[PDB]
Amino acid sequence: KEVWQVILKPKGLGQTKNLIGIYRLCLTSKTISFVKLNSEAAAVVLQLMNIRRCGHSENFFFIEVGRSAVTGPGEFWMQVDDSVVAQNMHETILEAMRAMSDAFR
């Protein structure tokens, strides 16, 4: 359970699905939820198992999502305040993905 405040950019699925602006991105051990600020409904709930890749570049964090995702395939790009926050998101989400694959063994 981590929560980050992000700006979802037009780039990729943002434009396509009109998911643009300030969201809270909430992480459990299995899913990531995008909730628009002041909304009482999650706009989209993604399973970690349907994320192909994630990464960052300075103050930007991205998720690429595969063919079985609720959104269909594509990329989300989000802007945060700085590269310390973006690296944190990368490392924490990567950590949850590894915990998920190791739980089988």
Binding site: I51, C54, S57
Partner: peptide, 9 residues
């Protein structure tokens, strides 16, 4: 860009 593949994909 720094990217990681998801081991649980």
């Amino acid at each position: 860009l720094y990217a990681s593949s998801n081991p649980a994909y």
